[PDB]
Amino acid sequence: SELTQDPAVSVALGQTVRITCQGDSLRSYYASWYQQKPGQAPVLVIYGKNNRPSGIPDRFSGSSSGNTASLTITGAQAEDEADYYCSSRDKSGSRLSVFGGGTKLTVLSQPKAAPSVTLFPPSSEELQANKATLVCLISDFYPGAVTVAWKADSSPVKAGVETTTPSKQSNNKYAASSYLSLTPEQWKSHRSYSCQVTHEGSTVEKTVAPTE
Amino acid sequence: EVQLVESGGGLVKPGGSLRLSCAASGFTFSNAWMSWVRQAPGKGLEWVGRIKSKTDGGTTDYAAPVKGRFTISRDDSKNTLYLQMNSLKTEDTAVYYCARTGKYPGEEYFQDWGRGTLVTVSSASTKGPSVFPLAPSSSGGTAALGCLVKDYFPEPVTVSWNSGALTSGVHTFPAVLQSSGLYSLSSVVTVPSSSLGTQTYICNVNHKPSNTKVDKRVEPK
């Protein structure tokens, strides 16, 4: 990922928010910016430097400094809630294009809520099928953005991990799921496994052990 | 008034081939650069490649993961852009977007985007789910329990609890497509810990494609 963005930011109605993109190619080129709402295709918001297409209001503006590019929204409105992506060349002189990882912008419409986390060890029945899945379920959080990290014996592990993007609950908060697939032998060979969930800069941990 | 409409997405096996089309109007097609961009379910945008206008040489450039496997071409007489996808891989599963591409060295930007068409790559055929309990045991007054629905194909699976009588606190998550080309999902419910000895909790898993229904009673360890 030659272009890097923060995964998530939030803003209150009427306030100003800045989303930043970083990469070596931004020293040579402007970044363009794209807005994508759930279930819709992207739309261009800024191109060149601070060119807003027709239909894009003035409150969106672009700027750049060194190897960074920034999208600023002044006076955030509910309709500005979306994922935002930057794009530019991957390096100077290249004929290729790349995107940043995207930033989820939440326009705050309900209280910030910390996730409830439950980590399920592999069921005995699944082990009988010669498989082992740790299931980390994450619910009731807002804004709908988390990062999930797994540990085995207190050290990081991220092979065999699959994580769903947060989606809405019936009560309008967010939930997400993460899976760590192991062999039965891997599962019974370690002392502990942990699911670490970071939300709004705070991290909670749940741990399970192949004993007890 | 600019219109871009992608078509041709479908289910295809690894190693197979698939041809996407993007039909365009509302701009002078022959003078436009045109790109493809893709997005795996729940993930970010990834540039696929771009073809220049005839006046600018008509040449193509490709992202490293697809170079040598996909071909971008255009038929200006039909206002149509194509993506010929060969040697398909499971990691190519994504919505594929067509984008009119502006230019001004200088970078390129994506002026207009289509709706997208979905490409799913898997070697699997119809396969019913295996259902495993996510059992509660020793969050305060409440406990979470659920059902893990593993390795089915194709989508969808639906899940209810107690034949629909239980809805409060229920959440069924989106499915994950694994490298195996099979899907898995989970469903969870949060209930009062004191009900675990009073109320029975059964997840009802329906997989219409395989003519399968599974009921799993979930009990504490």
Side-chain angles (χ1 to χ4, degrees), chain A residues 12-38:
Chain A
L13 283 173
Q15 297 215 114
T16 301
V17 61
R18 184 177 54 179
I19 297 166
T20 299
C21 183
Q22 187 171 2
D24 296 330
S25 68
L26 301 185
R27 295 183 180 281
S28 300
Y29 306 109
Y30 296 121
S32 52
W33 289 95
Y34 304 87
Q35 175 194 76
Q36 188 180 35
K37 298 180 180 175

Short mmCIF file of all heavy atoms in Angstrom, two decimals, chain A residues 12-38:
data_model
loop_
_atom_site.label_atom_id
_atom_site.label_comp_id
_atom_site.label_asym_id
_atom_site.label_seq_id
_atom_site.Cartn_x
_atom_site.Cartn_y
_atom_site.Cartn_z
N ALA A 12 -18.69 15.64 14.60
CA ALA A 12 -20.02 16.07 15.00
C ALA A 12 -20.65 16.93 13.91
O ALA A 12 -19.95 17.57 13.11
CB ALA A 12 -19.97 16.84 16.31
N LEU A 13 -21.98 16.96 13.88
CA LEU A 13 -22.68 17.80 12.92
C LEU A 13 -22.18 19.24 13.01
O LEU A 13 -22.05 19.79 14.10
CB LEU A 13 -24.19 17.76 13.17
CG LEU A 13 -24.96 16.53 12.71
CD1 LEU A 13 -26.40 16.59 13.21
CD2 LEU A 13 -24.94 16.39 11.20
N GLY A 14 -21.90 19.84 11.85
CA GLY A 14 -21.49 21.22 11.78
C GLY A 14 -20.03 21.49 12.06
O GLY A 14 -19.58 22.63 11.89
N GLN A 15 -19.26 20.49 12.48
CA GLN A 15 -17.85 20.69 12.78
C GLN A 15 -16.99 20.35 11.58
O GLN A 15 -17.46 19.86 10.54
CB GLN A 15 -17.44 19.86 14.00
CG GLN A 15 -18.17 20.27 15.27
CD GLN A 15 -17.32 20.15 16.52
OE1 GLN A 15 -16.98 21.15 17.15
NE2 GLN A 15 -16.97 18.92 16.88
N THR A 16 -15.69 20.61 11.72
CA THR A 16 -14.73 20.41 10.65
C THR A 16 -13.90 19.17 10.92
O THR A 16 -13.54 18.89 12.07
CB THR A 16 -13.82 21.64 10.51
OG1 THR A 16 -14.61 22.80 10.25
CG2 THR A 16 -12.80 21.45 9.39
N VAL A 17 -13.59 18.42 9.86
CA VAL A 17 -12.82 17.19 9.98
C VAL A 17 -11.85 17.11 8.81
O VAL A 17 -12.13 17.59 7.71
CB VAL A 17 -13.74 15.94 10.03
CG1 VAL A 17 -14.57 15.82 8.75
CG2 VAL A 17 -12.94 14.68 10.28
N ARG A 18 -10.69 16.52 9.07
CA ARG A 18 -9.64 16.38 8.07
C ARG A 18 -9.24 14.92 7.97
O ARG A 18 -9.00 14.26 8.99
CB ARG A 18 -8.43 17.26 8.42
CG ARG A 18 -7.32 17.25 7.37
CD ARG A 18 -6.19 18.19 7.75
NE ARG A 18 -5.67 17.90 9.08
CZ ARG A 18 -4.68 18.55 9.67
NH1 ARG A 18 -4.06 19.55 9.04
NH2 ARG A 18 -4.29 18.21 10.89
N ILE A 19 -9.18 14.41 6.74
CA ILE A 19 -8.75 13.05 6.43
C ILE A 19 -7.46 13.15 5.64
O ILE A 19 -7.39 13.88 4.65
CB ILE A 19 -9.83 12.31 5.62
CG1 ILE A 19 -11.12 12.18 6.44
CG2 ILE A 19 -9.34 10.94 5.17
CD1 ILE A 19 -12.33 11.75 5.61
N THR A 20 -6.43 12.42 6.08
CA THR A 20 -5.09 12.57 5.52
C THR A 20 -4.63 11.28 4.85
O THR A 20 -4.89 10.18 5.34
CB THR A 20 -4.09 13.00 6.60
OG1 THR A 20 -4.49 14.26 7.14
CG2 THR A 20 -2.68 13.14 6.01
N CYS A 21 -3.94 11.46 3.72
CA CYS A 21 -3.35 10.42 2.92
C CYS A 21 -1.84 10.66 2.89
O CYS A 21 -1.40 11.81 2.81
CB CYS A 21 -3.95 10.48 1.50
SG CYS A 21 -3.46 9.25 0.28
N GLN A 22 -1.05 9.59 2.99
CA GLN A 22 0.40 9.74 3.04
C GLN A 22 1.08 8.72 2.14
O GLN A 22 0.69 7.55 2.10
CB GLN A 22 0.93 9.58 4.48
CG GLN A 22 2.41 9.89 4.63
CD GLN A 22 2.86 9.94 6.08
OE1 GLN A 22 2.07 9.70 6.99
NE2 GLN A 22 4.13 10.25 6.29
N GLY A 23 2.11 9.18 1.42
CA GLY A 23 2.89 8.32 0.55
C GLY A 23 3.92 9.10 -0.25
O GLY A 23 3.74 10.29 -0.51
N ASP A 24 5.01 8.44 -0.64
CA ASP A 24 6.11 9.14 -1.31
C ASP A 24 5.67 9.79 -2.62
O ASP A 24 6.17 10.85 -2.98
CB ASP A 24 7.26 8.17 -1.58
CG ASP A 24 7.88 7.64 -0.30
OD1 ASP A 24 7.85 8.36 0.72
OD2 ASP A 24 8.40 6.50 -0.32
N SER A 25 4.74 9.16 -3.34
CA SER A 25 4.31 9.70 -4.62
C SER A 25 3.58 11.03 -4.47
O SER A 25 3.50 11.79 -5.44
CB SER A 25 3.42 8.70 -5.36
OG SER A 25 2.19 8.53 -4.69
N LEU A 26 3.03 11.31 -3.29
CA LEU A 26 2.35 12.58 -3.09
C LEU A 26 3.31 13.76 -3.08
O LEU A 26 2.85 14.91 -3.14
CB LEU A 26 1.54 12.54 -1.78
CG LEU A 26 0.48 11.44 -1.71
CD1 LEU A 26 -0.34 11.55 -0.44
CD2 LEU A 26 -0.44 11.45 -2.93
N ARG A 27 4.62 13.52 -3.01
CA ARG A 27 5.58 14.60 -3.19
C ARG A 27 5.60 15.10 -4.62
O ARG A 27 6.00 16.25 -4.86
CB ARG A 27 6.98 14.13 -2.78
CG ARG A 27 7.10 13.80 -1.30
CD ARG A 27 8.52 13.42 -0.92
NE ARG A 27 8.64 13.11 0.50
CZ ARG A 27 8.72 14.02 1.46
NH1 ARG A 27 8.68 15.31 1.17
NH2 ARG A 27 8.83 13.63 2.73
N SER A 28 5.17 14.28 -5.59
CA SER A 28 5.18 14.64 -7.00
C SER A 28 3.80 14.97 -7.54
O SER A 28 3.69 15.79 -8.46
CB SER A 28 5.76 13.50 -7.84
OG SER A 28 7.09 13.20 -7.46
N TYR A 29 2.75 14.34 -7.01
CA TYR A 29 1.43 14.40 -7.62
C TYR A 29 0.39 14.82 -6.60
O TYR A 29 0.53 14.58 -5.40
CB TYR A 29 1.02 13.04 -8.19
CG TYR A 29 2.02 12.45 -9.15
CD1 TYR A 29 2.79 11.35 -8.80
CD2 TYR A 29 2.21 13.01 -10.40
CE1 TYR A 29 3.70 10.81 -9.67
CE2 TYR A 29 3.12 12.47 -11.29
CZ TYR A 29 3.86 11.38 -10.91
OH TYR A 29 4.77 10.84 -11.79
N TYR A 30 -0.66 15.45 -7.10
CA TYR A 30 -1.84 15.65 -6.28
C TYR A 30 -2.54 14.32 -6.07
O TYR A 30 -2.38 13.36 -6.84
CB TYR A 30 -2.78 16.66 -6.93
CG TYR A 30 -2.20 18.05 -7.05
CD1 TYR A 30 -2.06 18.67 -8.29
CD2 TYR A 30 -1.79 18.75 -5.92
CE1 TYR A 30 -1.53 19.94 -8.40
CE2 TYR A 30 -1.25 20.02 -6.02
CZ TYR A 30 -1.13 20.61 -7.26
OH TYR A 30 -0.60 21.88 -7.37
N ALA A 31 -3.30 14.24 -4.99
CA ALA A 31 -4.18 13.12 -4.76
C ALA A 31 -5.60 13.54 -5.12
O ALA A 31 -6.00 14.68 -4.87
CB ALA A 31 -4.12 12.65 -3.31
N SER A 32 -6.34 12.63 -5.74
CA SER A 32 -7.77 12.80 -5.89
C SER A 32 -8.47 12.03 -4.77
O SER A 32 -7.90 11.12 -4.16
CB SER A 32 -8.26 12.33 -7.27
OG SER A 32 -7.82 11.02 -7.58
N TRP A 33 -9.71 12.44 -4.50
CA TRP A 33 -10.47 11.94 -3.36
C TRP A 33 -11.84 11.47 -3.82
O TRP A 33 -12.48 12.11 -4.66
CB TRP A 33 -10.63 13.03 -2.29
CG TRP A 33 -9.36 13.35 -1.56
CD1 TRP A 33 -8.48 14.35 -1.85
CD2 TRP A 33 -8.84 12.68 -0.41
NE1 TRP A 33 -7.44 14.34 -0.95
CE2 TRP A 33 -7.64 13.32 -0.06
CE3 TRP A 33 -9.28 11.59 0.35
CZ2 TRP A 33 -6.87 12.91 1.02
CZ3 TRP A 33 -8.51 11.18 1.42
CH2 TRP A 33 -7.32 11.84 1.75
N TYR A 34 -12.29 10.35 -3.24
CA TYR A 34 -13.52 9.69 -3.61
C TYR A 34 -14.37 9.41 -2.38
O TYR A 34 -13.85 9.06 -1.32
CB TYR A 34 -13.21 8.38 -4.37
CG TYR A 34 -12.35 8.70 -5.54
CD1 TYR A 34 -10.97 8.76 -5.42
CD2 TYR A 34 -12.91 9.05 -6.77
CE1 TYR A 34 -10.17 9.11 -6.48
CE2 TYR A 34 -12.13 9.39 -7.83
CZ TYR A 34 -10.76 9.43 -7.69
OH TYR A 34 -9.98 9.80 -8.76
N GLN A 35 -15.68 9.60 -2.54
CA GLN A 35 -16.67 9.33 -1.50
C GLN A 35 -17.46 8.10 -1.90
O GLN A 35 -17.91 7.99 -3.04
CB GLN A 35 -17.59 10.54 -1.34
CG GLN A 35 -18.74 10.36 -0.37
CD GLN A 35 -19.78 11.45 -0.51
OE1 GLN A 35 -20.57 11.45 -1.45
NE2 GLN A 35 -19.79 12.39 0.42
N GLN A 36 -17.63 7.16 -0.96
CA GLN A 36 -18.43 5.97 -1.23
C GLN A 36 -19.34 5.68 -0.04
O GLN A 36 -18.85 5.39 1.06
CB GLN A 36 -17.55 4.75 -1.52
CG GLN A 36 -18.36 3.54 -1.98
CD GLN A 36 -17.50 2.33 -2.27
OE1 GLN A 36 -16.49 2.09 -1.60
NE2 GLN A 36 -17.90 1.56 -3.28
N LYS A 37 -20.64 5.71 -0.28
CA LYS A 37 -21.62 5.35 0.73
C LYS A 37 -21.97 3.87 0.63
O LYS A 37 -21.80 3.25 -0.42
CB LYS A 37 -22.87 6.20 0.58
CG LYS A 37 -22.60 7.68 0.77
CD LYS A 37 -23.86 8.49 0.61
CE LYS A 37 -23.56 9.97 0.80
NZ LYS A 37 -24.76 10.81 0.53
N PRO A 38 -22.48 3.28 1.72
CA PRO A 38 -22.77 1.84 1.70
C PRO A 38 -23.70 1.46 0.56
O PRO A 38 -24.74 2.08 0.34
CB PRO A 38 -23.42 1.59 3.07
CG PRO A 38 -22.89 2.69 3.93
CD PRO A 38 -22.75 3.88 3.04
#
